[PDB]
């Protein structure tokens, strides 16, 4: 029950084909 | 861009044949208000005379 410091913790804490396969084609 | 531009040619046709399925349902929708006007003109071919 010893508090811990501050600056330790804050230390601890498919789209893609859709657009190529019409590109290609067309 | 060639393949982009007749890709695009045939959509624009597309819309074509949206258009006159539009303009020929205006010339339908126009006559029956025309109809509503001749209706009452042939009142007045009455009472005029009168």
């Not at chain 1, 811990?4 to 498919?14: A, F, L």
């Not at chain 2, 959509?11 to 074509?16: F, G, M």
């Not at chain 2, 258009?19 to 339908?28: D, H, P, Y």
């Amino acid at each position: 029950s010893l508090p811990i410091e501050d600056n330790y913790i804050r230390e601890v804490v498919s789209k893609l084909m859709e657009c190529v396969n019409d590109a290609v084609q067309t | 861009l060639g393949k982009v531009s007749d890709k695009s040619r045939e959509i624009s046709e597309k819309y074509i044949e949206e258009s006159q399925a539009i303009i020929q349902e205006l010339v339908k929708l126009t006559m029956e208000k025309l109809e509503s006007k001749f209706t009452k003109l042939c009142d007045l071919e009455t009472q005029l005379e009168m």
